[PDB]
Amino acid sequence: SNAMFAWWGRTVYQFRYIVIGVMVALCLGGGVYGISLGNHVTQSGFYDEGSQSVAASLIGDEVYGRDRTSHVVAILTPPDDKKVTDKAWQKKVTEELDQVVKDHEDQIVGWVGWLKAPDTTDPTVSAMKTQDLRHTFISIPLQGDDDDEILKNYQVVEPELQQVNGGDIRLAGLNPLASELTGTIGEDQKRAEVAAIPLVAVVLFFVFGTVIAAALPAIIGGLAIAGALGIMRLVAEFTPVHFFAQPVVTLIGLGIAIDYGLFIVSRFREEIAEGYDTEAAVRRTVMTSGRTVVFSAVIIVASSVPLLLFPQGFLKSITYAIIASVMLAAILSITVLAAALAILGPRVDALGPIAFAAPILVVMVLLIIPLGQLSLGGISEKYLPPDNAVRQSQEQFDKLFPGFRTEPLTLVMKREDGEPITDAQIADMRAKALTVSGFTDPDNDPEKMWKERPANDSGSKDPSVRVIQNGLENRNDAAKKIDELRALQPPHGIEVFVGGTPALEQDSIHSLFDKLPLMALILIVTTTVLMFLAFGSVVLPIKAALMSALTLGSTMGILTWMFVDGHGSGLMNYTPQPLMAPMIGLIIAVIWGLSTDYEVFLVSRMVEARERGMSTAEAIRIGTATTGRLITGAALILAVVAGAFVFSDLVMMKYLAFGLLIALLLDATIIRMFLVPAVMKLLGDDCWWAPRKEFNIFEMLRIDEGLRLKIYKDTEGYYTIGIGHLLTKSPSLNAAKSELDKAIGRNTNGVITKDEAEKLFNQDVDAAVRGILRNAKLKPVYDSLDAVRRAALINMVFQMGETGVAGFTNSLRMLQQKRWDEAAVNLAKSRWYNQTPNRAKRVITTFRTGTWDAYEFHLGGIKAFHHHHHHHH
Ligand SMILES: CCCCCCCCCCCCOC[C@H]1O[C@H](O[C@H]2O[C@H](CO)[C@@H](O)[C@H](O)[C@H]2O)[C@H](O)[C@@H](O)[C@@H]1O
Ligand SMILES: CCCCCCCCCCCCOC[C@H]1O[C@H](O[C@H]2O[C@H](CO)[C@@H](O)[C@H](O)[C@H]2O)[C@H](O)[C@@H](O)[C@@H]1O
Ligand SMILES: CCCCCCCCCCCCOC[C@H]1O[C@H](O[C@H]2O[C@H](CO)[C@@H](O)[C@H](O)[C@H]2O)[C@H](O)[C@@H](O)[C@@H]1O
Ligand SMILES: Cc1c(C(=O)NN2CCCCC2)nn(-c2ccc(Cl)cc2Cl)c1-c1ccc(Cl)cc1
Ligand SMILES: NC(=O)CN(CC(=O)O)CC(=O)O
Ligand SMILES: NC(=O)CN(CC(=O)O)CC(=O)O
């Protein structure tokens, strides 16, 4: 979990050109493929595919024919205050309808209404005119055998349909609504493009203050959107992908991808500032923030995968879109972006107590409970704003022609014997149905209840299956009534499925509450276990768990307060109503994933700040201080993009956009600035509790002068051993062993162990220090600098002796005055740099940054061994 990133940090620099070359190609390549996604999405996926109501629907459609009476209904109004019985007006509007049908029989079944045969004596067909005879409504059924294909047929037809009767015609019903709701997806996209993008740019340019560093996270976000669209278009080949998946790509793209790059470009900028070369800088960015971004991605994946337990194809498409977008953004941010930073380098900056935890926990259990007012429902026309025209057409359809809009509950019966269902068997099942109270009798007659479902040409008309249906008299009674009709023991040899839109809707709701317990368990445990792996603590996952658990109930609290009870509904032009039931599942996961993502970008920095070597109090203030500006900048970029989506006409889109605004504002202030810094010193030293090598001068000179466990001849021809330790200049090898035996204290016959070399090396060091402390030109600088920077100066004394490095009077002076950059530049102009660059560049870098990094990740190995000065004996 800590060396692969060092592995990848090195190689993304070596092959930086092909890396930026291939994945930009594929993302753009995915972009051209993915643009077609909108023509391969579905509106279906809100019900439970394994439910008995879905079985009841499936069987009922197959046998009786899909119900198409609610597809399109159109209200007609004669102009100039003529009345619909005007035979001239009648003649002109029907021949217009007849012409629309003949032009579009591949999409229109036909049109039916009182306007056909206006001399009829039918009570219901005469109920298609109003009493003042100034409005009449026709029903216009259409071709197709899934929702999607039928909607694409309505949109071909309605331009030519809206113009009948000189435009004085209002279109309502299933397909007009579905068209308006699915049409909000496209409008919310263009509002993101227009408002969020420039706003995001401004926030970036304020966080970085320079064009190049600001433009990079924007280009990453663009590439992730292009790549994720290509992936989801590919997923479309194999399984239906809901409409709602496309806005999810845009969100994560403009939001998380851009925020991922903000964290990385910011970390590259700091490492440049601390004196690291750019290829050093790229490696340590990947090893820290790249690891943080990667583990952020897997956390979010760990939070969205649990939604795959729910059956709705709607939640599955969304889950796939989160997964694809999020890690494409992680992968993009440590490939395309890192390679870019490796190419440019510094030119990214080229252009222009209990006193606060208590009165806050009080107000967040304050908000958790407005829940319990939470109610759930299906799609109605109320998902649109009240001034929306087609919603108004529906609401006046149901005012002028009441009683045609129905949601009958269905008892689909089938006998797998295969032979017909006799009249006594349905009279049987009918009798069992009148058992249950709560159903409608416009006839005051039980004998006229539970009529057969109507049947049309699309139906197979198999005799071994019959459907009877009857509307409900109060739909809030539906869940229990449905359970009651299923409790009926069927006749002998028949299976009875309970159908109807209230059965589909209710069965969907029952599946969520049935799998919601386990979903909550998987989610919080895997996120918990994950954070234990990211830090090594066992309380910092548990501190994050109950904070996240609390910002969840509070945000759900406000949302119910706003969308069930309506506080803000008049302001923001939405109707208060029960929530789309699978929206609760989606909202829970994404908000949980957001709360725990905040607790990694802040705490993983102070986990880093403390493992370096510090106590608590400061580690948290370092962590909070260095991340303070970045997390707000990241917070505002999310808040900007989400703020565009709160103005969506579709009320489930507003619900979700608001959930994130309330959630990311609550954590970017109340939690991050106040509550957990409080609890982070409150329980202050066991933050890092869990039940389950430092570099040094030995290891650095081992790299620069080698480590040899048996006598060898150096470049000059002299017998050497260990770390550059000269034994003798005698040609006799026996004289070298005689001296090696003397130095170690035993018969070596030319070989020592590692610890023996270490004991020999230390003696050489001690002699080098004694010399340094006895030179007027080296001792003052030597005293000036720290343990690491002293090792670099001892290295020089080893390679060239005291007189040698004492000749660097300027650079030693600059080092004494802590002017590291000036000394690094001056020393690199020496002759010692050009003769032994790999070691001089390595040593100078240690003066610049004051750490071992040039030695912990070094190039190749050395091939020319040379005994150092200050060989002790
Ligand atoms: C981006 C957000 C978009 C918002 C969503 C738009 C709301 C419009 C809802 C229109 C649905 C048409 O409802 C009318 C139909 O419903 C059921 O069939 C539907 O339910 C079955 C089991 O699910 C499927 O197998 C059928 O294919 C499927 O047509 C009935 O069995 C049909 O007799 C009836 O014709
Ligand atoms: C969420 C949005 C919800 C939208 C709500 C909108 C609901 C609208 C329901 C419309 C019900 C229309 O009613 C349909 C009627 O017309 C048909 O009969 C006709 O059949 C022959 C056609 O050639 C002719 O002989 C005669 O015109 C006639 O008898 C059917 O047999 C019956 O079904 C019913 O009588
Ligand atoms: C700081 C950021 C730097 C770079 C950010 C730029 C990202 C661009 C915003 C989103 C990417 C381009 O659009 C992505 C979306 O559009 C596609 O095509 C459609 O685009 C319009 C839809 O309203 C119509 O004009 C067309 O009918 C139709 O083909 C897809 O159908 C959608 O699935 C997809 O979501
Ligand atoms: C899980 C998450 C996060 C998150 O943890 N972000 N982390 C990133 C690193 C820094 C700390 C915050 N953000 N967003 C997000 C994305 C776009 C916008 Cl417009 C607003 C937001 Cl809230 C979402 C998210 C994911 C899926 C959906 Cl369907 C909706 C929202
Ligand atoms: N790096 C050094 O200090 C060597 N100096 C020589 C000196 O200061 O005596 C060369 C210079 O003036 O830059
Ligand atoms: N062959 C080597 O690696 C010797 N080194 C010099 C040394 O290690 O003393 C060459 C260099 O660093 O440029």
mmCIF file of N, CA, C and O in Angstrom, residues 512-558:
data_model
loop_
_atom_site.group_PDB
_atom_site.id
_atom_site.type_symbol
_atom_site.label_atom_id
_atom_site.label_comp_id
_atom_site.label_asym_id
_atom_site.label_seq_id
_atom_site.Cartn_x
_atom_site.Cartn_y
_atom_site.Cartn_z
ATOM 1 N N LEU A 512 -37.257 -1.850 -0.981
ATOM 2 C CA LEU A 512 -36.253 -0.953 -0.415
ATOM 3 C C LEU A 512 -36.122 -1.152 1.088
ATOM 4 O O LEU A 512 -35.026 -1.417 1.596
ATOM 5 N N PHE A 513 -37.233 -1.017 1.822
ATOM 6 C CA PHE A 513 -37.213 -1.256 3.261
ATOM 7 C C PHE A 513 -36.757 -2.672 3.609
ATOM 8 O O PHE A 513 -36.310 -2.910 4.737
ATOM 9 N N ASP A 514 -36.847 -3.615 2.670
ATOM 10 C CA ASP A 514 -36.442 -4.982 2.966
ATOM 11 C C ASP A 514 -34.935 -5.167 2.864
ATOM 12 O O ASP A 514 -34.366 -5.982 3.599
ATOM 13 N N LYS A 515 -34.275 -4.432 1.969
ATOM 14 C CA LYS A 515 -32.830 -4.524 1.800
ATOM 15 C C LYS A 515 -32.091 -3.327 2.381
ATOM 16 O O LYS A 515 -30.857 -3.313 2.373
ATOM 17 N N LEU A 516 -32.811 -2.327 2.884
ATOM 18 C CA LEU A 516 -32.155 -1.177 3.496
ATOM 19 C C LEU A 516 -31.347 -1.527 4.740
ATOM 20 O O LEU A 516 -30.288 -0.909 4.940
ATOM 21 N N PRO A 517 -31.770 -2.455 5.612
ATOM 22 C CA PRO A 517 -30.900 -2.814 6.752
ATOM 23 C C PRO A 517 -29.516 -3.285 6.335
ATOM 24 O O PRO A 517 -28.512 -2.729 6.802
ATOM 25 N N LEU A 518 -29.435 -4.289 5.457
ATOM 26 C CA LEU A 518 -28.133 -4.825 5.070
ATOM 27 C C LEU A 518 -27.299 -3.772 4.342
ATOM 28 O O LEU A 518 -26.100 -3.630 4.607
ATOM 29 N N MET A 519 -27.925 -3.010 3.434
ATOM 30 C CA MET A 519 -27.212 -1.952 2.718
ATOM 31 C C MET A 519 -26.506 -1.012 3.685
ATOM 32 O O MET A 519 -25.348 -0.636 3.467
ATOM 33 N N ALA A 520 -27.194 -0.615 4.757
ATOM 34 C CA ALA A 520 -26.572 0.244 5.758
ATOM 35 C C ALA A 520 -25.391 -0.443 6.429
ATOM 36 O O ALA A 520 -24.393 0.214 6.745
ATOM 37 N N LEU A 521 -25.474 -1.759 6.636
ATOM 38 C CA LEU A 521 -24.400 -2.477 7.316
ATOM 39 C C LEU A 521 -23.160 -2.570 6.435
ATOM 40 O O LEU A 521 -22.081 -2.112 6.824
ATOM 41 N N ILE A 522 -23.296 -3.177 5.247
ATOM 42 C CA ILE A 522 -22.172 -3.286 4.316
ATOM 43 C C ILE A 522 -21.484 -1.940 4.172
ATOM 44 O O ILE A 522 -20.264 -1.816 4.343
ATOM 45 N N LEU A 523 -22.273 -0.907 3.896
ATOM 46 C CA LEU A 523 -21.721 0.400 3.570
ATOM 47 C C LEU A 523 -20.782 0.897 4.662
ATOM 48 O O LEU A 523 -19.593 1.133 4.413
ATOM 49 N N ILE A 524 -21.279 1.002 5.897
ATOM 50 C CA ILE A 524 -20.473 1.636 6.941
ATOM 51 C C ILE A 524 -19.315 0.743 7.386
ATOM 52 O O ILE A 524 -18.253 1.257 7.749
ATOM 53 N N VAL A 525 -19.457 -0.590 7.339
ATOM 54 C CA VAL A 525 -18.327 -1.443 7.732
ATOM 55 C C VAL A 525 -17.183 -1.342 6.729
ATOM 56 O O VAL A 525 -16.027 -1.149 7.124
ATOM 57 N N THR A 526 -17.475 -1.462 5.431
ATOM 58 C CA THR A 526 -16.395 -1.438 4.451
ATOM 59 C C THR A 526 -15.719 -0.070 4.415
ATOM 60 O O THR A 526 -14.489 0.021 4.299
ATOM 61 N N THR A 527 -16.494 1.007 4.528
ATOM 62 C CA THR A 527 -15.860 2.313 4.660
ATOM 63 C C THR A 527 -15.034 2.377 5.938
ATOM 64 O O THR A 527 -13.914 2.898 5.932
ATOM 65 N N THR A 528 -15.552 1.823 7.040
ATOM 66 C CA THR A 528 -14.789 1.829 8.284
ATOM 67 C C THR A 528 -13.483 1.063 8.126
ATOM 68 O O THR A 528 -12.402 1.604 8.382
ATOM 69 N N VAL A 529 -13.566 -0.199 7.691
ATOM 70 C CA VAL A 529 -12.360 -0.995 7.487
ATOM 71 C C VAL A 529 -11.395 -0.269 6.567
ATOM 72 O O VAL A 529 -10.177 -0.283 6.786
ATOM 73 N N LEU A 530 -11.917 0.392 5.533
ATOM 74 C CA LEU A 530 -11.037 1.083 4.600
ATOM 75 C C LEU A 530 -10.205 2.141 5.319
ATOM 76 O O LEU A 530 -8.972 2.133 5.230
ATOM 77 N N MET A 531 -10.854 3.046 6.061
ATOM 78 C CA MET A 531 -10.106 4.116 6.721
ATOM 79 C C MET A 531 -9.090 3.581 7.719
ATOM 80 O O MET A 531 -8.049 4.213 7.936
ATOM 81 N N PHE A 532 -9.368 2.435 8.339
ATOM 82 C CA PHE A 532 -8.350 1.792 9.162
ATOM 83 C C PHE A 532 -7.112 1.457 8.337
ATOM 84 O O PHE A 532 -5.980 1.551 8.830
ATOM 85 N N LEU A 533 -7.303 1.081 7.069
ATOM 86 C CA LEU A 533 -6.179 0.765 6.195
ATOM 87 C C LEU A 533 -5.477 2.003 5.668
ATOM 88 O O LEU A 533 -4.317 1.911 5.253
ATOM 89 N N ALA A 534 -6.144 3.154 5.670
ATOM 90 C CA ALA A 534 -5.551 4.365 5.123
ATOM 91 C C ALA A 534 -4.690 5.112 6.131
ATOM 92 O O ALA A 534 -3.782 5.850 5.733
ATOM 93 N N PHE A 535 -4.958 4.949 7.421
ATOM 94 C CA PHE A 535 -4.234 5.677 8.455
ATOM 95 C C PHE A 535 -3.495 4.768 9.420
ATOM 96 O O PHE A 535 -2.375 5.089 9.828
ATOM 97 N N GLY A 536 -4.080 3.629 9.775
ATOM 98 C CA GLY A 536 -3.543 2.781 10.813
ATOM 99 C C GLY A 536 -4.204 2.979 12.153
ATOM 100 O O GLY A 536 -3.807 2.333 13.127
ATOM 101 N N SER A 537 -5.188 3.863 12.233
ATOM 102 C CA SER A 537 -5.922 4.069 13.464
ATOM 103 C C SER A 537 -7.174 3.207 13.494
ATOM 104 O O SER A 537 -7.649 2.705 12.472
ATOM 105 N N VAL A 538 -7.684 3.020 14.707
ATOM 106 C CA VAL A 538 -8.926 2.298 14.935
ATOM 107 C C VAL A 538 -10.020 3.198 15.494
ATOM 108 O O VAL A 538 -11.216 2.870 15.367
ATOM 109 N N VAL A 539 -9.678 4.361 16.039
ATOM 110 C CA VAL A 539 -10.697 5.305 16.493
ATOM 111 C C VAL A 539 -10.975 6.338 15.403
ATOM 112 O O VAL A 539 -12.089 6.856 15.324
ATOM 113 N N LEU A 540 -10.007 6.664 14.541
ATOM 114 C CA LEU A 540 -10.355 7.636 13.498
ATOM 115 C C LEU A 540 -11.358 7.131 12.464
ATOM 116 O O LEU A 540 -12.011 7.982 11.840
ATOM 117 N N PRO A 541 -11.441 5.837 12.129
ATOM 118 C CA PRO A 541 -12.640 5.381 11.417
ATOM 119 C C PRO A 541 -13.929 5.513 12.229
ATOM 120 O O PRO A 541 -14.971 5.938 11.698
ATOM 121 N N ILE A 542 -13.896 5.166 13.516
ATOM 122 C CA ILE A 542 -15.100 5.234 14.332
ATOM 123 C C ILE A 542 -15.471 6.679 14.640
ATOM 124 O O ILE A 542 -16.651 7.002 14.792
ATOM 125 N N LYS A 543 -14.506 7.589 14.726
ATOM 126 C CA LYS A 543 -14.937 8.978 14.882
ATOM 127 C C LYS A 543 -15.617 9.454 13.610
ATOM 128 O O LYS A 543 -16.572 10.244 13.666
ATOM 129 N N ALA A 544 -15.128 8.994 12.445
ATOM 130 C CA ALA A 544 -15.717 9.454 11.192
ATOM 131 C C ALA A 544 -17.072 8.827 10.977
ATOM 132 O O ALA A 544 -17.933 9.434 10.339
ATOM 133 N N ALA A 545 -17.280 7.617 11.513
ATOM 134 C CA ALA A 545 -18.518 6.872 11.273
ATOM 135 C C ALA A 545 -19.727 7.570 11.892
ATOM 136 O O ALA A 545 -20.764 7.723 11.235
ATOM 137 N N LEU A 546 -19.601 8.026 13.146
ATOM 138 C CA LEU A 546 -20.746 8.623 13.823
ATOM 139 C C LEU A 546 -20.927 10.085 13.458
ATOM 140 O O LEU A 546 -22.040 10.605 13.542
ATOM 141 N N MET A 547 -19.871 10.766 13.046
ATOM 142 C CA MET A 547 -20.058 12.071 12.420
ATOM 143 C C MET A 547 -20.799 11.945 11.107
ATOM 144 O O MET A 547 -21.735 12.705 10.833
ATOM 145 N N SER A 548 -20.340 11.033 10.253
ATOM 146 C CA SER A 548 -21.053 10.770 9.015
ATOM 147 C C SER A 548 -22.477 10.316 9.299
ATOM 148 O O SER A 548 -23.425 10.773 8.651
ATOM 149 N N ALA A 549 -22.650 9.422 10.278
ATOM 150 C CA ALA A 549 -23.986 8.951 10.637
ATOM 151 C C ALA A 549 -24.873 10.079 11.130
ATOM 152 O O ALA A 549 -26.103 9.968 11.076
ATOM 153 N N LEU A 550 -24.274 11.164 11.590
ATOM 154 C CA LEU A 550 -25.065 12.240 12.138
ATOM 155 C C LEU A 550 -25.349 13.314 11.083
ATOM 156 O O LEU A 550 -26.488 13.781 10.964
ATOM 157 N N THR A 551 -24.361 13.670 10.257
ATOM 158 C CA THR A 551 -24.634 14.570 9.138
ATOM 159 C C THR A 551 -25.580 13.944 8.116
ATOM 160 O O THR A 551 -26.162 14.668 7.299
ATOM 161 N N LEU A 552 -25.753 12.621 8.148
ATOM 162 C CA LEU A 552 -26.743 11.975 7.291
ATOM 163 C C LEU A 552 -28.156 12.258 7.783
ATOM 164 O O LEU A 552 -28.992 12.786 7.042
ATOM 165 N N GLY A 553 -28.445 11.903 9.039
ATOM 166 C CA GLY A 553 -29.781 12.109 9.568
ATOM 167 C C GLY A 553 -30.196 13.566 9.594
ATOM 168 O O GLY A 553 -31.385 13.879 9.474
ATOM 169 N N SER A 554 -29.228 14.475 9.740
ATOM 170 C CA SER A 554 -29.535 15.903 9.750
ATOM 171 C C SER A 554 -29.903 16.402 8.359
ATOM 172 O O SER A 554 -30.859 17.171 8.202
ATOM 173 N N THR A 555 -29.142 15.990 7.342
ATOM 174 C CA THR A 555 -29.442 16.404 5.974
ATOM 175 C C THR A 555 -30.765 15.817 5.499
ATOM 176 O O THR A 555 -31.578 16.517 4.882
ATOM 177 N N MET A 556 -30.997 14.532 5.768
ATOM 178 C CA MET A 556 -32.326 13.982 5.537
ATOM 179 C C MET A 556 -33.377 14.771 6.302
ATOM 180 O O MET A 556 -34.493 14.969 5.806
ATOM 181 N N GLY A 557 -33.031 15.244 7.498
ATOM 182 C CA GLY A 557 -33.928 16.060 8.284
ATOM 183 C C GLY A 557 -34.373 17.305 7.551
ATOM 184 O O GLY A 557 -35.576 17.538 7.401
ATOM 185 N N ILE A 558 -33.419 18.107 7.073
ATOM 186 C CA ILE A 558 -33.793 19.330 6.368
ATOM 187 C C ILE A 558 -34.592 19.000 5.108
ATOM 188 O O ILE A 558 -35.625 19.623 4.836
#
